[model samples]
Target chain A: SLFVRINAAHGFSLIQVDNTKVTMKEILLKAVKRRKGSQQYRLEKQSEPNVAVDLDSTLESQSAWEFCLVREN
Target chain B: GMTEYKLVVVGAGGVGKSALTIQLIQNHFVDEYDPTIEDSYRKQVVIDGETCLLDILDTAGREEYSAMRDQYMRTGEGFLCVFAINNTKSFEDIHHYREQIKRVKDSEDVPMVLVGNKCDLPSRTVDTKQAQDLARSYGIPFIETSAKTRQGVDDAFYTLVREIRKH
Candidate 1:
């Protein structure tokens, strides 16, 4: 498993997902769990604002992909 | 075309890490209890005649959530190690953060700045000279700031960018 770092409104979280290819949906689920059951947030590519990370998209392992869990405002 | 600089704000709780970031981006002060879990922001500013994008990460400073700090530390190209001038404990905690940042980055020459916030307060436990001496020991810039008064707030972030630019 590879650790995926997610930046949220309060602090940082690490989601250990299977290596190789993991869908954004799986990572989003883990983020929700780590957030203590708060489903009012969405993940976005940290380097790219206003761009939603598609849930169906697969994340490549060994690549640096940073995410931010932002509240719906 | 402009470059993107990833900067992280770190320090003990109640040191105004979020306050500084919000003051820079939102141009206002949030004098409330909105805890920063981990937040990211983007701002474009001209530094020394060069336009650049600052991708800033405002992190949680509570001791309990400290375990989550290293992950973001690794992602930051530069760091703003903040502490409140009125809070002695928070000032003391800056040493641990400076050391941890170097440890996580695994480099002694990383770009960073020591920030003293809440300078608008009447009482100050951490003296300006003490902070300046500490920053000199580390060979980094030291800045005094107040998120509420917006004093030295821009300089704090801009100086870090300059450090990264020169690094």
Candidate 2:
């Protein structure tokens, strides 16, 4: 079971290990669920070798944050 | 004959810019990772008997880097613009993406491929027709792909390369 951890400036979101096979949706849903109550955030997936999950919160509480997940061999 | 090609993948941050690049290069899907630098670069070996040295510049999402997107666009030969099929908001940002391409690209006739990523999640789709229409309006090739499934991922890159070869 491989899980992805999404962290924000204020706090963090830990997504359950859906499977060894991870899709962009799984990562994003986890991020969205973790940061549900947050003001504004968008999770963008980067290229392979490095998947970049970026979050943007314009609200005073959360301005901007980005996280990237690399597959652990 | 030696042909030098510089390819750039540009989109609103999470639209699978990097995923597409990896799929095209490694013929496999990869998950998002940390940003080592502002952008990432790679050289790919294509199955079509040609090697593509891809400058996969993975940029931050629009909401975060709205101001600097233009600068990123200025450094490439062709553009791989991606958006998620399920996310209409990402699709809507195509204009801004297009504007940046036009501004930075050396020529108005620059070759581009409009990729509709996340085809694996058909249920979450917002506007398939709209995406096609937008690509048609721009006179660029449009295709849907799922990085997770590796569906249409290769076609997107090959199509763009073939199109570029025509010129």
On DockQ, the leading prediction is 1
Reference-based lDDT, each prediction: 0.82, 0.60
For every prediction, compared with the true complex, DockQ reads 0.08, 0.03
Candidate 2, after superposition: displacement of residue B68 in Å?
4.3
How high is the TM-score of chain A in each model? Answer: 0.81, 0.44
What TM-score would candidate 2 get against the native? 0.61
Q: What are the per-residue Cα lDDT tens digits for candidate 1 across B39-152?
A: 667778998899888888878887776877878889889999999899998988989998898999898888999999998899889898999999999999999999999999
Q: What's the lDDT for residue B27 in model 1? A: 82
Cα lDDT of model 2 by residue, B82-141, tens digit: 888778778877778777678667467877889888887847755767877888899988
Each candidate's fnat, listed in order, reads 0.05, 0.00
Q: Please provide, for model 1 over A1-73, each residue's C-alpha lDDT reduced to its tens digit, 9 standing for 90 to 100.
A: 2567887764466565657488888888878654443335677888888577777788873245679888666
Candidate 2: lDDT of B88? 79
Instruction: Report lDDT (Cα) of residue B74, candidate 1.
Output: 90
